[PDB]
Amino acid sequence: MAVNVYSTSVTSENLSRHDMLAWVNDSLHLNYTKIEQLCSGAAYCQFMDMLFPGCVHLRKVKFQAKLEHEYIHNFKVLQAAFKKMGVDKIIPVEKLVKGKFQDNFEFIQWFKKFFDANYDGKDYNPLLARQ
Amino acid sequence: MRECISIHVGQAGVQIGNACWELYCLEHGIQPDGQMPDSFNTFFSETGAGKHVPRAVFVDLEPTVIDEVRTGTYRQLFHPEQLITGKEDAANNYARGHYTIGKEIIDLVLDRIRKLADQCTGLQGFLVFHSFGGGTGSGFTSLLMERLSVDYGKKSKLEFSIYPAPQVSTAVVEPYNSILTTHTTLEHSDCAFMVDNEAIYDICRRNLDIERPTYTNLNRLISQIVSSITASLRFDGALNVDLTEFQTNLVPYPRIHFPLATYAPVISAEKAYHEQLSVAEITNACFEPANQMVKCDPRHGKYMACCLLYRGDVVPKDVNAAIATIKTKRSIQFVDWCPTGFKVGINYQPPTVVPGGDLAKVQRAVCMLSNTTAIAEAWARLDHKFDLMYAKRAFVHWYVGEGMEEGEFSEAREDMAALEKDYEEVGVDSVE
Amino acid sequence: MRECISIHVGQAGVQIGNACWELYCLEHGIQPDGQMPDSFNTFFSETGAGKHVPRAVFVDLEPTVIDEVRTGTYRQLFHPEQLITGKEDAANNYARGHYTIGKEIIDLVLDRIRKLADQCTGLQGFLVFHSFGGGTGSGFTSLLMERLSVDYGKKSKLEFSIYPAPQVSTAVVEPYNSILTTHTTLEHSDCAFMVDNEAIYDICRRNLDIERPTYTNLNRLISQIVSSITASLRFDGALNVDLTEFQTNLVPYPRIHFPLATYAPVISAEKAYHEQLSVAEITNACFEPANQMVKCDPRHGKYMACCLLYRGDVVPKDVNAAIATIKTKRSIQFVDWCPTGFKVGINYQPPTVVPGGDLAKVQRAVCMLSNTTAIAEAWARLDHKFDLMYAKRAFVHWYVGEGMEEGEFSEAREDMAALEKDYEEVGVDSVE
Amino acid sequence: MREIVHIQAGQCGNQIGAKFWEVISDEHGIDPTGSYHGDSDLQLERINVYYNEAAGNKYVPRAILVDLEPGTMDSVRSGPFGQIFRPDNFVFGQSGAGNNWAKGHYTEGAELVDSVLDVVRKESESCDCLQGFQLTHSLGGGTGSGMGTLLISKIREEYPDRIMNTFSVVPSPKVSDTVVEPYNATLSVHQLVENTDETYCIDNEALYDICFRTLKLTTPTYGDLNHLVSATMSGVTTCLRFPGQLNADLRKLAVNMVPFPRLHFFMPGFAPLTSRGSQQYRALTVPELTQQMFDAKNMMAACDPRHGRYLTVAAVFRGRMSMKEVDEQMLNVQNKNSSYFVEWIPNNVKTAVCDIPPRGLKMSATFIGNSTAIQELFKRISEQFTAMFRRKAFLHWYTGEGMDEMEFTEAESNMNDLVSEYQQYQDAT
Amino acid sequence: MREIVHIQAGQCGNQIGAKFWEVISDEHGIDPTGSYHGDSDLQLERINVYYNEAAGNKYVPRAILVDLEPGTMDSVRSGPFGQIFRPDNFVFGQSGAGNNWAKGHYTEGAELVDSVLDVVRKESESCDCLQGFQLTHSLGGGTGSGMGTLLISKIREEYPDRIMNTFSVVPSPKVSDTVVEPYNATLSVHQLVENTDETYCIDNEALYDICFRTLKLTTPTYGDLNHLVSATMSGVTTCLRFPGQLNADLRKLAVNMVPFPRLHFFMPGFAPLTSRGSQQYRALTVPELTQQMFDAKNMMAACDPRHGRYLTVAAVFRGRMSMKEVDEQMLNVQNKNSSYFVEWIPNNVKTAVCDIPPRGLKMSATFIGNSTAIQELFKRISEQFTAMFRRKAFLHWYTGEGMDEMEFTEAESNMNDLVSEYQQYQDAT
Ligand SMILES: Nc1nc2c(ncn2[C@@H]2O[C@H](COP(=O)(O)OP(=O)(O)OP(=O)(O)O)[C@@H](O)[C@H]2O)c(=O)[nH]1
Numbered sequence A: 001m002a003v004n005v006y007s008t009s010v011t012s013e014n015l016s017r018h019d020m021l022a023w024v025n026d027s028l029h030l031n032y033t034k035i036e037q038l039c040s041g042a043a044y045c046q047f048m049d050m051l052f053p054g055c056v057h058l059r060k061v062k063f064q065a066k067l068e069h070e071y072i073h074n075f076k077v078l079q080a081a082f083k084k085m086g087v088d089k090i091i092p093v094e095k096l097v098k099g100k101f102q103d104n105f106e107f108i109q110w111f112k113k114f115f116d117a118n119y120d121g122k123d124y125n126p127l128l129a130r131q
Numbered sequence B, C: 001m002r003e004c005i006s007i008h009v010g011q012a013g014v015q016i017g018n019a020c021w022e023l024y025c026l027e028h029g030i031q032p033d034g035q036m037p038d039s040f041n042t043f044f045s046e047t048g049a050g051k052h053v054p055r056a057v058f059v060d061l062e063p064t065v066i067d068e069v070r071t072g073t074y075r076q077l078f079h080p081e082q083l084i085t086g087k088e089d090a091a092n093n094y095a096r097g098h099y100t101i102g103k104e105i106i107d108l109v110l111d112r113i114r115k116l117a118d119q120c121t122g123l124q125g126f127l128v129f130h131s132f133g134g135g136t137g138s139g140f141t142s143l144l145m146e147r148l149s150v151d152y153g154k155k156s157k158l159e160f161s162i163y164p165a166p167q168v169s170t171a172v173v174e175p176y177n178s179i180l181t182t183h184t185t186l187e188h189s190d191c192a193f194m195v196d197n198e199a200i201y202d203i204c205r206r207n208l209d210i211e212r213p214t215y216t217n218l219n220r221l222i223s224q225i226v227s228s229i230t231a232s233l234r235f236d237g238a239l240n241v242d243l244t245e246f247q248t249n250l251v252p253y254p255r256i257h258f259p260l261a262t263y264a265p266v267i268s269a270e271k272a273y274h275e276q277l278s279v280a281e282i283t284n285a286c287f288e289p290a291n292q293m294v295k296c297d298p299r300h301g302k303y304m305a306c307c308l309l310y311r312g313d314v315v316p317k318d319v320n321a322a323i324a325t326i327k328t329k330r331s332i333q334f335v336d337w338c339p340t341g342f343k344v345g346i347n348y349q350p351p352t353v354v355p356g357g358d359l360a361k362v363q364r365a366v367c368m369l370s371n372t373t374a375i376a377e378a379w380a381r382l383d384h385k386f387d388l389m390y391a392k393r394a395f396v397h398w399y400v401g402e403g404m405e406e407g408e409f410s411e412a413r414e415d416m417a418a419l420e421k422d423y424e425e426v427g428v429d430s431v432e
Numbered sequence D, E: 001m002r003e004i005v006h007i008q009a010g011q012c013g014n015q016i017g018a019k020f021w022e023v024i025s026d027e028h029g030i031d032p033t034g035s036y037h038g039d040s041d042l043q044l045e046r047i048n049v050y051y052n053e054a055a056g057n058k059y060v061p062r063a064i065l066v067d068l069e070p071g072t073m074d075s076v077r078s079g080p081f082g083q084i085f086r087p088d089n090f091v092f093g094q095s096g097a098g099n100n101w102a103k104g105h106y107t108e109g110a111e112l113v114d115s116v117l118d119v120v121r122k123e124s125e126s127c128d129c130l131q132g133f134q135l136t137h138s139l140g141g142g143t144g145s146g147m148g149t150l151l152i153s154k155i156r157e158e159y160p161d162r163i164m165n166t167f168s169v170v171p172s173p174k175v176s177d178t179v180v181e182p183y184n185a186t187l188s189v190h191q192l193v194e195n196t197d198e199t200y201c202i203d204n205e206a207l208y209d210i211c212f213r214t215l216k217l218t219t220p221t222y223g224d225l226n227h228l229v230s231a232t233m234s235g236v237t238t239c240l241r242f243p244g245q246l247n248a249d250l251r252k253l254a255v256n257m258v259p260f261p262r263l264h265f266f267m268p269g270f271a272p273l274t275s276r277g278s279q280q281y282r283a284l285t286v287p288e289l290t291q292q293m294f295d296a297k298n299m300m301a302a303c304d305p306r307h308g309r310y311l312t313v314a315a316v317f318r319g320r321m322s323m324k325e326v327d328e329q330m331l332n333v334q335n336k337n338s339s340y341f342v343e344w345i346p347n348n349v350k351t352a353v354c355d356i357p358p359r360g361l362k363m364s365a366t367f368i369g370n371s372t373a374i375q376e377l378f379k380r381i382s383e384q385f386t387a388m389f390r391r392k393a394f395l396h397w398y399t400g401e402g403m404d405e406m407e408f409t410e411a412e413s414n415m416n417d418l419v420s421e422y423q424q425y426q427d428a429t
């Protein structure tokens, strides 16, 4: 069971670039220095696993993706997970995979809201998920 | 490149849309058949043949008003799929608009929007025309805004709304519709431009010497304001403003997104001669309360932002001079947290006049978009109206019958109370 | 050189054939008398005089439908020996078609086919038109396929089949006929292109604005798809596909040989103007479920192969671009064992329009042939239908009376069960 | 040698730039097609400072045009001289910045910046000995301000040993042309102080005054304002492009005018400026020119030099004139107006003379003043910033783009510190 | 002397071939009838490299056209230049291959191969000193891929001491043009590694990009793609056909570019490429050309050279130009981009200059890069192959033609080994 969120015109409820990156690194044990590195989709797929036990076939996800098509593949996996959970937000895949800051920042702000709505506090060691 | 897509909801929205698209055609030299014997492209898509189609959607829950479009002078101008009609209207009921009747056509409307947006290379966003009082204008529009926010989000959405008058109503349930729609749409809209029928009527009578103004006249006037707002995108200019800038310049706090529009000069042929109509003169006219298109008193409020959009034979120095003098004037007070209150646009193209129109042809015009704490008066009034009826639960059964819950009335009311307090807080000057 | 021979079985097959051959004549400039005032030669044999005869056989077990061909506008187009009729029909009974009545004319049909093939220098194979539901379309066609497999074998055989709808039937015994014919024909056919009357009707009403579509309209639509498939052989093109390639590109496992056809754009003169109809636009249209010609939901299935056949004013780069974006789209999922899912054909000749047709003349069209696990739904439904009737042995006496054995019902059923499980297995993603 | 790379950002940046390029082409005898139709060999000698030579006897501006929306660009393309520019040197976005510094610096601008950098690098590699960069833009908008500053940051990182100079159109005192202008200016200034070597402050209020009072133009247009600015711009590089008697360049001017690294904000002026009727009643002599230069009414920044002290003043003369006379005049102003000149920098007037005058004129002069009075401008901005920031007005437009209050705070502090620094040297003995 | 035999297989192979022959005829002043109407003696001097001289002052391409279906052939015959070809040199089947490598290599192709071989042998016997063979085809189809490889195998067996080179149109990354393309490519590659001396990898994705971004062609046609490829092709043999200052040929290029026998897969590039409007704003100088050559966006293979290292790079210049300048430019790229060049092959840039430029141009350049980045392409194919083969998808189409799983397996393994080999040298110090 999942729910949907919207962010457009708000105040005092949006994370700075630094804070948001810090959250992602702490949550998933990652070392990103640019928000645009999230455009590979592996991180988002991992977050899905942590939120909703089961859900994604993580053995198919490429965690060290370097090429546009690899990123596309990860987002297909993510798309399937969104379908399974009934989250109705359209992911702008073509814009995300170009690694553009604006679009990636928009998506992370939505995804953070979505995560907060749905996260139950369970422990999750993402290293095992990775390998 | 900089595309802009227009959505016309319910009778008001559609009829204003008819006036707007008639004007646009005249401005770009597009015939009623879509033919012209490059800037138009922001509002018109173009076929393989020499034909141009409005980037527009017209929606109403009943067929009557749209049927006129279909059978009228501009039948060939619009593509059939952009004129969307249901069977039964929302019967002045927000519930019917938002839920019972609206849920049947929302998907269709959104699908067409998606297709429109697909053919844009640089979509700037949406212009939404409706009213606060009707079941469609209130309920359907709120629904639509929700969906648009979800599916697009960061695209700037602008609303032009026929805000109801103090002493000139059309329906009995107007306050309910107004309150609910404002509540539901507030977090989804970026800026909403209010206009009031009473004010426009008064202007028509006093300034244009019209004994008996028709809705057509009001629509025409509205069209002018729209043109001023979009002329920066449809023409070349000296100093430019593009739809995203308005929100930046006029909205100081997220909730306080209701500016008001004022146009100058509105004159007849008899009064167009006998006077020179300088930039200073029209600027002064704009500020003065009698020329405003909302029945509200700025002398009793404070200005938080003014945006001045000049068009035609205009000289930037002159504009600067005019503004400076208005700044000095005792009757114009600005909030203490805003030393810089003016955003200024200047465009080369004079306002074009519709054949058989009530306005005379002028060398210059100006459209002011101004945000004022004085508008809070209207909100208070509306709240009072809601209170009087709700205390007796008058008409409430209708809304509940269409699936609304009574608690939602209270919810909407409290949200509006909060909004009123926000304005009041903003009003006060800074300590220390 | 690259000859292709068309076989039209029963009422559906014959009537679709009439529509197809009318279209072919218009496309190649062949008059109803066989006269023309070189590529046509793949479908028409040529006499000593300036006359052209279809490489076709029309077969029905009763005379009525073929008699119309004989007495109609194209009486001179066909040679008498290519119009084959018996005395009594198969009476919606597979048994009568396959055994009792069919065994009397099969030899004749095959003899004529042999003679047709003798005058081919590079016969590519056969196009077979029929339906699943009729006694002739089901029973006779299955018989015919058996014989063709024996006498030719490696020649690629393609079937166009009027697959029965979920909620729109014509006969009561349809499920029986469908199941048996599918069982008996499965190992003998290389690829079968399903089309559904309900879907086409819906399309006619929604997309073509036709209040009351006739079978003629459906036939015409079908003809278009056929033309797209065969245009690569009948015209010159940039990037080509020849009948043998379809089987290679669309059939991943021997049993899973049921793709589905979708055509775009299907529009009227009123809606042909008012829009530019780009390659991206039509490609997107194709995928979307509402334009499909089978009453099935791809959103609930996975794509295993798509073949896109473009025709007319088309640019390969543009096609590539269009496909790329569709690949990204969330609503299009492909099976995990298929990273490359698109086969693309581009032909220079625009779709030609039949005088008095329901479709408008367009610069571009596209015909998608797509194989989807979603079609398994239909199979399940059909199985369920079989089960309900068979549990009571309803109508079974008819079939047994014509020499069928009851055990063969069970056999056919189990084979279809197996087929259903095959699809399901295919559906799942790869382990590790 | 000493090739300059020109960069234009946003509406104002591009519109000034177009005018500047029209002027320079006229000066060097280049027509709207890029062909040389001039008379003298001096016009071509140093043509490479601003132009690349293309095939078939054409010259193309070493100019890069940047905007987050395509309208201004389009206009430029359609304008007189629009066809002279390299098509590949127009770098335009589709979104716009919506008068938001954040969008220009961090969001939309960031999506575009790399594409611009790529062009810039290529341009740099053209040049045998790159002098540096001149950037034209406003501080009040989103593109010129946010994206321009970003460009400055990156270019400087890439080329730290070249000169970085800017022609910045600053917010006026009397009336604002934007509601959030104090924010945009404030954020810009923080960047400028750390990343530019010199910044010419130009203010439309001053320009209008000049047009109205001095040029006697009842109805000036933005074009007429732009022309003045372009004349100043051309004046600053004149000694790099034409032989003279005492040759200046961009480096020398910086050295003479900037005694401390942060104090690199100038107030430019130009002379002579006269009406059509009123020019026949005056003599264009050196002293007259000097007098015109050294007044307050002819400064293009909205601050009175009489409210502060001149740290350093550079005077650049164009035309055939007497060096002795110039020296006399410069000495005279220092002697008689002693109280307006800082006492601890003796002989704080720097002079340059280029023999080639501008078109139509026998002689002309350009003034560069580094005055402690410019602190007033900064103070105003700080005040305006404060009034808005204390109530967090419009802040969600910037925070919505990922920015934090901390950044704003730091910017405010930095600006205040700069003002303090100016004050300190004003009062020093 | 040094006569080349041209071979064309399948649709793509034939369509490229037609374009190539149109180009070469134009170059040598040959019209659609085979008659010489050129101006200079240099055009005829080495005409025998590509043309046989027939009776009555006509020239006929030493070209063999092969296809398992007759449509493309027919089109070619009806095309402009169709009548120049020897009628007996069209070898066409009637069946087709149905996009099946098996059919092309073992079945239909096998029925046709001997007939082609017979023609080929005759052609070879014409020539006084046969240089070798150039084969044009795709790896994604059935004819060009399966039948082409068969031809390569047989020809090589017959003539093991001649050069075997191929212009192979490879499957792209973004979108496939065939469902079984990974199979067909994979099987092809196994043959190519053992039987060709050099293979130019050309990818339509790259070509489209070039057309769109560099040539500014909104609506490119396949013809326009073909022309680019033909220009590259002509560039590679230019020094064999025209006198120059430093003469290359096919053997020398192979020697310079192939340090290990299996690593013979190149990424070609061509310069200069410009729009109609945008050409007047640039100068066609050697450095510019060099820069255009050595970027990633101008490579015709879908792999970024910045993701690997260049093993060896050959640059072929056509036009009257300075050798010193060329040497400077080549040195410069090596020096400044040191990290993109393998460290254990010093001076890994080979230069050739032919004095005769292409038509319409003052100078032109062709680039041949042997980059370890091409391994990415192979890896992709291997991955795609795996995904399908693990589920035995479409396999019955190939096994039905007599093929076994073992063959597939071996092919997969061989391809993997090649990738490993590339990786090894990428990482070697
Ligand atoms: N300015 C202007 N106002 C209009 C026009 N038509 C209607 N209105 C105003 O709109 C309000 C009535 O709402 P409508 O738009 O008619 O109602 P609706 O949206 O169709 O909703 P339902 O009919 O209840 O489904 C009143 O305040 C009218 O005065 C018009 O042409 N111009």
Ligand SMILES: Nc1nc2c(ncn2[C@@H]2O[C@H](COP(=O)(O)OP(=O)(O)OP(=O)(O)O)[C@@H](O)[C@H]2O)c(=O)[nH]1
Pocket: C009, C010, C011, C012, C013, C015, C016, C061, C089, C090, C091, C092, C093, C131, C133, C134, C135, C136, C137, C138, C162, C164, C170, C197, C215, C216, C218, C219
């Ligand atoms: N699309 C289309 N479907 C048709 C047409 N005529 C019949 N059908 C369909 O074909 C099925 C009925 O089969 P028929 O072809 O009439 O029967 P038959 O093959 O003559 O077999 P018997 O009459 O039982 O010997 C039904 O699903 C009809 O809807 C037609 O002209 N077009």
Ligand SMILES: Nc1nc2c(ncn2[C@@H]2O[C@H](COP(=O)(O)OP(=O)(O)O)[C@@H](O)[C@H]2O)c(=O)[nH]1
Pocket: B238, B239, B240, D009, D010, D011, D012, D013, D015, D016, D097, D099, D137, D138, D140, D141, D142, D143, D144, D145, D169, D171, D177, D178, D204, D222, D223, D225, D226
């Ligand atoms: N001198 C001059 N100033 C201009 C011109 N155009 C705009 N401005 C000023 O620049 C400011 C607006 O910023 P602008 O550059 O248009 O915004 P941006 O495009 O977002 O950077 C206002 O203060 C204008 O007065 C011009 O052509 N000349």
Ligand SMILES: Nc1nc2c(ncn2[C@@H]2O[C@H](COP(=O)(O)OP(=O)(O)O)[C@@H](O)[C@H]2O)c(=O)[nH]1
Pocket: C238, C239, C240, E009, E010, E011, E012, E013, E015, E016, E097, E099, E100, E137, E138, E140, E141, E142, E143, E144, E145, E169, E171, E177, E178, E204, E222, E223, E225, E226
């Ligand atoms: N560059 C180029 N590629 C082509 C052309 N024609 C076909 N192709 C490509 O070749 C592949 C199809 O193979 P093809 O040679 O038609 O099949 P075959 O005839 O069975 O070998 C696809 O990837 C096409 O994009 C052409 O004219 N030019």
Ligand SMILES: [Mg+2]
Pocket: B010, B011, B062, B089, B134, B136
């Ligand atoms: Mg209504």
Ligand SMILES: [Mg+2]
Pocket: C010, C011, C062, C089, C090, C134, C136
């Ligand atoms: Mg029948």
